[PDB]
Amino acid sequence: GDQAATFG
Amino acid sequence: ELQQNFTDNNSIKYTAILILIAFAFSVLARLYWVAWASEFYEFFFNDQLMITTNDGYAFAEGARDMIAGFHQPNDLSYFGSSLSTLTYWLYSILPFSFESIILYMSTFFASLIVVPIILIAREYKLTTYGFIAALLGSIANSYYNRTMSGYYDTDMLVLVLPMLILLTFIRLTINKDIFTLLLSPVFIMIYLWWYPSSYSLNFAMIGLFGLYTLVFHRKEKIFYLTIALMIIALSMLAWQYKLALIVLLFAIFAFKEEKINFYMIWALIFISILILHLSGGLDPVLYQLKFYVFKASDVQNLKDAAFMYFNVNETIMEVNTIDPEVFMQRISSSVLVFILSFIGFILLLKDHKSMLLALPMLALGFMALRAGLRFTIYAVPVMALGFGYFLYAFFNFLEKKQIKLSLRNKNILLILIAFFSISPALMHIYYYKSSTVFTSYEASILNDLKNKAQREDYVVAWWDYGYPIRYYSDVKTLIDGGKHLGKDNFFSSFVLSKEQIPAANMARLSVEYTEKSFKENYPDVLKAMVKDYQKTSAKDFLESLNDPNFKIDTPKTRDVYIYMPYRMLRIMPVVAQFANTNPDNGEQEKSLFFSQANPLDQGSITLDNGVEISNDYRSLKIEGNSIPLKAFVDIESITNGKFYYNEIDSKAQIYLLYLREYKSYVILDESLYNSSYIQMFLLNQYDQDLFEQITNDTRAKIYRLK
Ligand SMILES: CC(=O)N[C@H]1[C@@H](OP(=O)(O)OP(=O)(O)OC/C=C(/C)CC/C=C(/C)CC/C=C(/C)CCC=C(C)C)O[C@H](CO)[C@@H](O)[C@@H]1O
Ligand SMILES: [Mn+2]
Ligand SMILES: [Mn+2]
Ligand code: NA
């Protein structure tokens, strides 16, 4: 949830 | 022991004991994950657990480089940053390993939030309710998430400082404490030094402190003076100018009773607003709003000075939206406690007008509903006080309605209420079995890269990995956690998702032009590439990149590595989407069929995403629709490139990949199958004239240009 990473 | 009265007690000894109990509770509570994670070899490196957000490695690199005393020119090292600097001081002062310090700092400082919560509650003579509120606020879902052990990031003090500023305003409203004239500004400075984005909150809070003062203290000089000092503290004056002004006006107001004439202080307010204006004032607020609240794509405001790029905002986990249940649990670990917390906040407001000054943080947290979950943080402690107030209210009812309750039994009732309502946060902690950023194996691969490559080299990767690679490998990256706009991401997207001839042309051209742009400041690097090789559009240049007879007039200044880890597989479509966007256009080019899923058991295979794999291994079933496969590729060695290409249908277009070494399936289209990633990683097929294999592992491959 609280990550400065990619998703989708 | 329990028959006694705790509610009326507000002594300094009692409040110190309560602060100690709550702080120890906060630390203890964020110790469970350490206990859990320590039992998995996968989470260690250098004999310690690893950091737990991507961004911590940015400050971790910065801390390391401050310890070492240097970085390279234009690796974008957080050298001198606040969290890096505090890490460096603590490292130089303490006996514990670097990794242990970086693991536990958040666990310590985020727990300081307990202090202002129960001191604010105490200013209202509610210290015990403050104690309960601090227990809730210290471990509430979203606040825990960004401050657990290993969350080595700037969140760990990002509400403590604003809550201390709030406490400062309260003490001013109740006791007219002259020491506010000093602390309000100093804290703003610390906040601005620790988290420059805090500017926006500061601007809002200071702004409100003025309007509040125009209403409730329209005649008290001390409020106007402290406003001038705080606006100065918001400005860009050098630290010595700021502190000089603050101490000067502080002494003159503290020790003069003829004091400062009112006209002089309105003059000071004007001088202040001028200084803050010169410092850029309000612009950072509108920019942050532009990115998070209005989610604009072109945020730098360059029409035709740049190309058009995919918008990264809808791609970051922190900024993803959230439904009301999750909003409320993020804030209060439970809907019930959230409702009661909100009631409590209303009642507290309509009893202590000064709690009005908490509205900015509250507002910021609620702004999460538009701006992404990462903002709910700001509503946790405010709302926690609200819940505290609700409890004070409730038992108050029970006496203003003459309910016969012992002290021992009222206290048993309070302990039970607080424990039962704090339960959801503990459950969340227990279930929030978060894992390390990377696995020991990946950190090991990147450290071996460190000992193999040079400090001035680049590794092209996706931006998710920029901070860990620069930490573990001590190299340069094209994009990272804070440099990840569309215009930035395009190059790594292209290198990783296009075919190899143009992927290597783009890896060389992008690394070289980035390095040049450090000396030349191109508003758009792709546009610089275009307008150098005398091309008319982005599409024109990129398609001209397809030539095996391509002249390379930019000389080679370093090696260029490409990092291709297994964990990128599942975000390949998202990575691909960036170079799938016509820079002349903003327009999407191909459709991108992709997903990775795990077989369930062992007659019709189902996979997580409901995709039925044919018994035949010849068709899929998405949403009730059966779609034919072009080929079933059964891959037994990612490193050996030993796989079995089973022809099915030359006329069809979808590929099914089986990863034996992971027991996983991939469903993709022709365009993604030929991408540099799927080919060089999964199938181990690379043009040996274009790349050299540097590291070959089932979990990751590192290639070098030549
Ligand atoms: C190691 C690393 O890479 N870290 C990266 C990461 O860190 P970061 O999150 O901390 O930085 P940020 O995203 O810019 O913070 C903005 C978050 C705010 C709460 C502050 C401002 C947000 C607003 C929406 C303004 C609201 C305005 C007000 C006046 C408050 C009142 C509002 C009401 C009442 C509705 O992200 C950055 C991405 O660029 C990187 O630069 C940075 O490097
Ligand atoms: Mn962060
Ligand atoms: Mn470096
Ligand atoms: Na294990």
Residue numbers in the entry:
A (entry chain B): 10 to 17
B (entry chain A): 2 to 603, 608 to 711
From the manuscript:
N-protein glycosylation is a post-translational modification that is conserved in all domains of life. The oligosaccharide is first assembled on a pyrophosphate-lipid carrier and then transferred en bloc to conserved sequons (N-X-S/T) of secretory proteins. The reaction is catalyzed by an integral-membrane oligosaccharyltransferase (OST). X-ray structures of ssOSTs of Campylobacter lari (PglB) and Archaeoglobus fulgidus (AglB) have revealed the fold of the enzyme.
Here we present the X-ray structure of PglB in complex with an inhibitory peptide and a synthetic reactive LLO analog. We chose 2,4-diaminobutanoic acid (Dab) to replace the acceptor asparagine, because Dab-containing peptides were previously shown to act as competitive inhibitors of bacterial and eukaryotic OSTs at physiological pH. We used the reactive synthetic LLO analog ωZZZ-PP-GlcNAc, which is chemically very similar to the wild type LLO except that it contains a GlcNAc rather than di-N-acetyl-bacillosamine as a reducing-end sugar. The key difference is that the two substrates are closer in the new ternary complex, with a distance of ~3.4 Å between carbon C-1 of the GlcNAc moiety of reactive LLO and the –NH2 group of the Dab residue, representative of the atoms that would form an N-glycosidic bond if Dab was replaced by Asn. Whereas the lipid tail of the LLO analog has an indistinguishable conformation to the previous ternary complex, the pyrophosphate and GlcNAc moieties have shifted and interact differently with the surface of PglB in the new structure. We now observe continuous electron density between the pyrophosphate group of LLO and the catalytic Mn2+, with the shortest distance (~4  Å) observed between Mn2+ and the oxygen linking C1 of GlcNAc and the pyrophosphate moiety. The structure also revealed different interactions between the pyrophosphate of the LLO and two essential catalytic residues, R375 and Y196. In the present structure, the N-acetyl group can form hydrogen bonds with the side chains of both D56 and Y468. The Dab side chain reaches the catalytic site where it can form hydrogen bonds with three conserved and catalytically essential residues, the side chains of D56 and E319 and the main chain carbonyl oxygen of G482.
